[PDB]
Design a binder for this molecule. Structure first.
Ligand code: ZN
Ligand code: ZN
Ligand code: ZN
Lengths: 290, 338, 82, 359
């Protein structure tokens, strides 16, 4: 029943000895407060968050306390962690400039929770709140690319192709110059998925075919990409580019193991396909392709 | 050579003059019109204009735009380019500051500090990223308020602040006499963060303020040394190491009620490519005999892999047309002429 | 009472575009993916201008082949950067 | 002598006793100083502001006279112009136009006594703008004539400013021919460094005149220049300029989305521009049904000004012509009622459109 200890924090503010003593007192009071488990603990964290934003405490000590509190923080049940995450996110709003980077980290953690809570709607909104571009503090290229790819994937899983396309365009605006290797492959995968979702089937098939020749990617994912390219080029609008792509896939010996080889045979030679033939081909199509 | 006209255009109190200043400016242009190598003069004048307008104020914008207009003649509208942009940026900064003052006086009129912004354009000015130093909480409110106001006025612009090219005034309260300081951002931050507490070590300054080590060393080089009375220290000249115990003396007997320690401004610290371009120009010709200038530039850009700047294109075209390799009646077309 | 208090503060800032370029006005495709005909035919990069509009290179050359006018601002097109 | 200049600071520091003590303190600031310098300029001003705060017009009038004879030399032209503009604005914020008029008259006469130059030019320009605020024409016209005589080339800024003022007056006086003549005259100046507000003002009128006459390429160029120069200077006219640019682009046969430019993309979601954005997106990628739906839904917000309504007849006909051309392309002998069904118009309109297209 150590509820009053948070009020003791006020008595820490009266000290005028501006040195490591205040940092140690804050660290030890945080250590004492985190030992609780009930709603008293939730009130404790709350009070701590609403006291950290106070202007009386110096910027450096408050920043250090906030950052180590966040870095040790998330070891609680998910519900209380989400509640306190929302509380601190809405509380640090008046002083975002002085508490920028910390807030960013917190937001990322919140998105992580929505990754395991099966919520692709609010996860994108939470990840958007991070000021990647605006702000006196700028991040590296890799962080921006990873955040944009995560947002694009999250929006894609929510059946919102417009926002996914916008954020993949934002990512590609800076993807050209980068040092990471797997990030380029992930960006190509996300762009191909976005093009597939936007019903640009021939471009998606071209991107998937180009992706299938990559050596870093695993063989199983290569076969999956080839299957996706075949499905996209079968659904693509009839024409000359589609026929050229069909010939290109036909000249590949890996199409035999694919389940849609017969349709490829009947389409490459320009033969009319009966209605009953596509009875089983439409079963393997993606839900958004029907 | 442009240093003379920069000093003549600089603010100098008694240097203030009359229409004969315009006559002397015309005389300077008379000496300039027959001088070759205009690129160096233009670059030096751009640097001088940036120095005069970005930090501090010049003698008068009158003669400034008069000189810009005079250089527009005999050179071309596209040749001047940037300087007109700097002038327009200064005008926009003045207008935006007036509007922000009106807005601040209108709603929640408190005015803790007097902000003065000088918003510039990314391209024209010789910009440079700041140290990303953490600003003390007294000036964060005005930064947020002006950012909100600018976003409300202009949509989708984003402000890229520079905390290395500004000034401020601090009302010192050491003892009797409010010695109004005039400091740069680094010194403002150091003094303000030292205000809460006493005797912070150099590593404490690095942690609390976040200035880069070299810039912080340069800043703490001042506030002492000169006149050996701003701060009394046993070492002289330069001696600063990690863990140094330094504290401002609790008295300031500087014998003038106008303190300016922002003295940092005073104590401030192809042949192969040209051959390839000429060969490309020749190869584009002896084929397309009559060709436009933009078409020729695009053709050379297509035929080359490395980027190359358009200035190289223009200078090589001029050099090789000087050698009677082409001839110039449209002014944007070239015949082969061998 | 503050030993140092800020009375006035003159700061120098900059403005930019939070989103510079997304599509070529000519081909309506992405700026940095491919120049539409380059996709059907099969590196080529963007070509800026004095007005800083940054079309493609094949697209701007095709436009210049007919008329020497910038598509958007309708000014004289002078090449800059590559 | 550092005491003399810095004692203004410690006399402005004991500014708690403004009445009968600040006046005396700055009075002895003047009397203890003989060197013509900026510090006396600061003194005058300070007491001018303090005195005008506590009424007492004649003393501040005399202090005006002292300041105006102080503007001859010593202080920089930039600071003197800034102080004159600041004092004029800080009084004009309280109206009381008669003492403002004597203010402007004294500035004009004093700057006539000294060199006039751009300082007197801009003082008279500000007086003309103040007259324009009242929309009265006689005083504005006479001030404009005085200004034009003073101007009457290496000084194109002055001509551009006076032409902008003339265009601003005549756009309220409703004189189309005068506006066209003034725009044609101002087209000659090519070596000026003006404020972007002036450039936008002189370009918007030219774009409107081109739109009225029938030209569309020059109208589009002028409207783009006006919008670009109106954005920067803040301005609350950027919108209508963007709407006019969109309309001119649509009347240009377009083929290129005007919202793909970096200078107009952020405004594509403005509440006053959304209807025009939808109209443009419907125009290209021909869709008559979507165009009609947008026109009917937004029939009360954009169908008010007499500039889009009069050009809506040119539209709804180019789009129909393009749809007809793209529809009759693969056929060789096509029924006319089929075309009427496709275009959602009666047979007579289809026949008239076909006859006009063939002719
Ligand atoms: Zn393009
Ligand atoms: Zn290409
Ligand atoms: Zn352009």
């Amino acid at each position: 029943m150590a509820a009053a200890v948070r009020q003791d924090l006020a008595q820490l503010m009266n000290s005028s000895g501006s040195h490591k003593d205040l940092a140690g007192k804050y660290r030890q009071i945080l250590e004492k407060a985190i030992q609780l488990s009930g709603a008293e603990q939730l009130e404790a964290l709350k009070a701590f968050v609403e006291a950290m934003v106070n202007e009386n405490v110096s910027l450096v000590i408050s920043r250090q306390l906030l950052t180590d509190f966040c870095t040790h923080l998330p070891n609680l049940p998910d519900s209380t962690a989400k509640e306190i995450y929302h509380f601190t996110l809405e509380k640090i709003q008046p002083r975002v400039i002085s508490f920028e980077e910390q807030v960013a980290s917190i937001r990322q953690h919140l998105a992580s929770i929505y990754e395991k809570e099966e919520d692709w709607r609010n996860a994108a909104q939470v990840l958007v709140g991070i000021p990647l571009e605006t702000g006196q503090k700028q991040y590296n290229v890799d962080y921006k690319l990873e955040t944009y790819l995560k947002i694009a994937r999250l929006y894609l899983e929510d059946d919102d192709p417009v926002q996914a396309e916008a954020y993949i365009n934002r990512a590609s605006l800076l993807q050209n110059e980068s040092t990471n290797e797997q990030l380029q492959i992930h960006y190509k995968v996300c762009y191909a998925r976005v093009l597939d979702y936007r019903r640009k089937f021939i471009e998606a098939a071209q991107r998937y075919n180009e992706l299938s020749y990559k050596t870093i990617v695993h063989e199983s994912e290569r076969l999956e990409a080839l299957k996706h390219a075949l499905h996209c080029t079968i659904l693509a609008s009839a024409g000359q580019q589609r026929s050229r792509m069909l010939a290109t896939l036909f000249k590949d010996e890996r199409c035999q193991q694919l389940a849609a080889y017969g349709i490829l045979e009947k389409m490459y030679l320009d033969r009319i396909i009966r209605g009953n033939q596509l009875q089983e081909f439409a079963a393997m199509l993606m839900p958004h392709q029907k | 050579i442009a240093k003379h006209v920069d000093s003549k255009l600089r603010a100098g109190n008694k240097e203030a003059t009359d229409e004969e200043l315009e006559r002397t400016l015309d005389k300077i242009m008379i000496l300039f019109r027959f001088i070759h190598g205009k690129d160096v003069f233009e670059a030096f004048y751009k640097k001088d204009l940036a120095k005069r307008l970005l930090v501090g104020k010049s003698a008068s914008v009158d003669a400034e735009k008069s000189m810009l207009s005079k250089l527009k003649h005999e050179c071309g509208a596209a040749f001047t380019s940037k300087l007109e942009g700097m002038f327009k940026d200064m005008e926009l900064s003045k207008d935006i500051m007036v509007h922000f003052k009106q807005h601040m006086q209108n709603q929640s009129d408190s005015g803790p500090i007097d902000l003065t912004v000088n918003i510039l354009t990314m391209g024209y000015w010789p910009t440079y990223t700041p140290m990303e130093v953490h600003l003390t909480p007294e000036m964060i409110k005005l930064q947020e308020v002006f950012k909100a106001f600018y976003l409300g006025k202009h949509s989708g612009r984003k402000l890229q602040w520079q905390t290395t090219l500004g000034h401020a005034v601090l009302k010192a309260e050491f003892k009797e006499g409010k010695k109004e300081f005039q400091v740069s951002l680094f010194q403002t931050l150091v003094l303000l963060m030292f205000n809460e507490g006493d005797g912070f070590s150099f590593e404490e300054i690095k942690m609390a303020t976040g200035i880069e080590d070299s810039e912080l060393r340069r800043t703490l080089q001042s506030l002492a040394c000169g006149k050996a009375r701003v701060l009394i220290k046993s070492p002289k000249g330069k001696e600063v190491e990690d863990g140094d115990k330094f504290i401002f003396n609790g008295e300031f007997k500087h014998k003038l009620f106008r303190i300016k320690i922002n003295q940092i401004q005073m104590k401030e610290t192809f042949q192969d490519r040209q051959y390839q371009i000429d060969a490309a120009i020749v190869r584009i010709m002896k084929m397309r005999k009559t060709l436009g200038h933009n078409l020729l530039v695009s053709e050379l850009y297509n035929q080359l892999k490395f980027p190359v700047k358009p200035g190289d294109l223009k200078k090589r075209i001029e050099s090789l047309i000087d050698r009677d390799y082409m001839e110039r009646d449209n002014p944007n077309q070239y015949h082969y002429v061998a | 009472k503050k030993r140092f208090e800020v009375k006035k503060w003159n700061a120098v800032a900059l403005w930019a575009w939070d989103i510079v370029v997304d599509n070529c006005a000519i081909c309506r495709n992405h700026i940095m993916d491919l120049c539409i005909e380059c996709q059907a035919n099969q590196e080529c990069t963007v070509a800026w201008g004095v007005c800083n509009h940054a079309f493609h290179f094949h697209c701007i050359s095709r436009w210049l082949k007919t008329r020497q006018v910038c598509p958007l601002d309708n000014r004289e097109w002078e090449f800059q950067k590559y | 002598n550092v005491d003399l200049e810095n004692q203004y600071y410690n006399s402005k520091a004991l500014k708690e006793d403004d009445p009968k003590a600040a006046l005396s303190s700055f009075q002895k600031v003047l009397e203890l100083e003989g060197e013509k310098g900026e510090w006396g300029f600061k003194a005058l001003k300070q007491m001018i502001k303090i005195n005008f705060k506590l009424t007492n017009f004649p003393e501040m009038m005399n202090r005006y006279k002292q300041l105006l004879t102080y503007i001859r030399s010593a202080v920089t032209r930039n600071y003197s112009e800034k102080s004159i503009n600041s004092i004029l604005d800080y009084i004009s914020t309280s109206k009381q136009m008669d003492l403002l008029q004597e203010f402007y008259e004294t500035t004009l006469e004093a700057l006539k006594d000294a060199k006039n130059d751009r300082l007197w030019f801009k003082t008279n320009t500000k007086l003309g703008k103040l007259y324009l605020e009242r929309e009265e024409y006689g005083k504005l016209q006479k001030i404009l004539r005085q200004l034009h005589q003073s101007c009457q080339l290496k000084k194109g800024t002055q001509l551009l400013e006076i032409y902008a003022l003339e265009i601003q007056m005549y756009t309220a006086q409703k004189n189309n021919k005068k506006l066209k003549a003034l725009y044609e005259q101002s087209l000659h100046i090519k070596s000026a460094i003006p404020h972007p507000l002036i450039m936008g003002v002189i370009r918007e009128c030219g774009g409107k005149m081109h739109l009225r006459e029938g030209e569309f390429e020059k109208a589009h160029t002028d409207f783009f220049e006006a919008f670009k120069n109106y954005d920067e200077s803040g301005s609350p006219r950027r919108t209508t300029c963007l709407k006019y640019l969109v309309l001119a682009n649509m009347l240009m046969k377009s083929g290129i989305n005007p919202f793909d430019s970096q200078e107009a993309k952020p405004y594509k979601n403005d509440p006053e521009i959304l209807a025009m954005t939808n109209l443009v997106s419907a125009y290209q990628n021909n869709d008559i049904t979507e165009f009609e739906k947008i026109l009917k839904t937004n029939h009360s917000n954009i169908m008010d000004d007499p500039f889009i309504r009069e050009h809506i007849e040119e539209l709804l006909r180019n789009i129909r012509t393009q749809v007809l051309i793209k529809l009759i392309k693969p056929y060789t002998r096509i029924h006319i009622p089929f075309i009427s069904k496709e275009l959602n118009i009666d047979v007579a309109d289809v026949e008239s459109l076909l006859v006009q297209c063939i002719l």
